[PDB]
Amino acid sequence: CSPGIWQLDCTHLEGKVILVAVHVASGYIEAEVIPAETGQETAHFLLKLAGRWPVKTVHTDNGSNFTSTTVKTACWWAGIKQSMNKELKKIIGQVRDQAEHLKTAVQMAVFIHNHKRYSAGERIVDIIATDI
Amino acid sequence: CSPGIWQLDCTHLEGKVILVAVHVASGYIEAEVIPAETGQETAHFLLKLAGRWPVKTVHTDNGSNFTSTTVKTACWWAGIKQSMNKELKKIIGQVRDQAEHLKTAVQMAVFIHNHKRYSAGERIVDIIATDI
Numbered sequence: 027c028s029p030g031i032w033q034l035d036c037t038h039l040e041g042k043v044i045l046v047a048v049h050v051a052s053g054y055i056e057a058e059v060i061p062a063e064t065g066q067e068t069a070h071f072l073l074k075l076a077g078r079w080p081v082k083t084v085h086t087d088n089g090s091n092f093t094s095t096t097v098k099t100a101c102w103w104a105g106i107k108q109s110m111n112k113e114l115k116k117i118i119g120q121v122r123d124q125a126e127h128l129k130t131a132v133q134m135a136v137f138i139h140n141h142k143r144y145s146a147g148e149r150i151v152d153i154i155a156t157d158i
Numbered sequence: 159c160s161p162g163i164w165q166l167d168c169t170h171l172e173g174k175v176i177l178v179a180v181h182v183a184s185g186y187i188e189a190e191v192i193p194a195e196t197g198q199e200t201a202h203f204l205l206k207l208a209g210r211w212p213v214k215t216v217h218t219d220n221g222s223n224f225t226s227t228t229v230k231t232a233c234w235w236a237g238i239k240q241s242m243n244k245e246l247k248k249i250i251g252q253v254r255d256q257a258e259h260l261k262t263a264v265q266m267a268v269f270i271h272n273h274k275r276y277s278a279g280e281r282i283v284d285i286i287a288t289d290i
C-alpha cells in the first residue's frame with residue numbers, strides 16, 4: 027500500500043485506553059496507553075507519530091475520533107489528511123505476567139510484534155526507504 | 159556509525175524533564191517530556207524505543223542514569239547493551255508560542271528536526287535498511 031498511510035484506533039483493556047497506530051502497508055505498530063480517550067490525547071499522539079515517520083493520511087474505524095478542532099489542528103500542523111488490535115491484545119496477555127503496569131506490557135507487545143518474522147519493522151524501513 | 163547505537167540523555171526546561179534519544183549515526187531524535195527524572199521513566203522509554211527501532215547499544219552523558227535494576231532489567235529484556243540537545247531546545251523556543259503545553263512543543267520540535275534537510279528521518283531509514 028501507499029507508504030504514508032496509517033490506521034489509528036483506540037482500544038480498551040483493564041479499564042484503560044490503548045491507542046494503536048498501524049502502518050497499513052507493513053503492519054508496524056506504535057501503541058501507547060492513554061488515561062482518557064480524548065481528542066487531546068489523539069492530537070498529541072498524531073504530532074508524535076508524524077515527527078517519527080512520514081504520515082501522509084490517517085484512517086480510523088471510528089470517524090468521530092477525528093472531529094475535534096484539537097485533532098484537526100494537529101492533522102493541519104503536520105500536513106496530515108484523512109484485525110490488528112486482537113493480535114496485539116493476544117501478545118499483551120502472553121507477556122502480561124512479566125510486568126506490573128499495563129503500559130509496560132503494551133510496549134513489550136509492540137516490541138514482540140514489530141520484530142517477529144521479514145518482520146514488520148524490517149518491512150516499514152524497506153518500504154519507506156524504497157519510496158526515498 | 160553503527161546502525162544500532164543510540165544516545166539517551168535527560169534535559170531540563172520549564173521545570174520539566176525532557177528525555178532525548180538520538181540515533182547517533184543519523185541525528186534522528188525521539189523525545190518525550192517525563193514528569194520525573196526517574197529510572198522507571200528511563201526503563202519504560204527504552205522499552206518503547208527498542209520496539210520501534212533496532213536498539214543494540216545505548217550511550218549517555220550521565221552514566222548513573224543506567225544503574226537502577228529497573229533500567230538494567232529493561233536493557234536486559236530488550237537485548238540492549240551499554241550537542242544535539244541545544245539544537246532541539248533552539249527549535250522548542252522557536253515554536254513555543256504555537257502551543258500551550260511544553261510537551262506539545264517538544265513533539266513539534268522533533269517533527270521539525272527529523273524532517274529538515276537529506277533529513278535525519280531519511281538517513282535513519284536509509285541506514286537501517288542498508289544494514290538489512
Ligand SMILES: Cc1nc2c(c(C)c(C)n2Cc2cnn(C)c2)c(-c2ccc(Cl)cc2)c1[C@H](OC(C)(C)C)C(=O)O
Nearest residue numbers: 124125126127130197198199201202227228231232235
Ligand atoms: C513498575 C516497575 N517496577 C520495577 C521493575 C523492576 C525490574 C524493578 C526492580 N522494579 C521495582 C520493584 C518491583 N517489585 N519490587 C519489590 C521492587 C519494573 C520492570 C518490569 C519489566 C521490565 Cl523489562 C523492566 C522493568 C516495573 C515496570 O514498570 C516500568 C515503568 C517499566 C519501570 C512494570 O510495569 O512492571
Ligand SMILES: Cc1nc2c(c(C)c(C)n2Cc2cnn(C)c2)c(-c2ccc(Cl)cc2)c1[C@H](OC(C)(C)C)C(=O)O
Nearest residue numbers: 065066067069070095096099100103256257258259262
Ligand atoms: C492543550 C491544547 N488545547 C487546544 C488545542 C487546540 C488546537 C484547541 C482548539 N484547544 C482547546 C482550546 C485552547 N484555547 N481555547 C480557548 C480552547 C491544542 C493544540 C495546539 C497545537 C496543535 Cl498543532 C494542535 C492542538 C492544545 C495543545 O495540546 C495538545 C495535547 C496537542 C491538545 C497545546 O499544548 O497547546
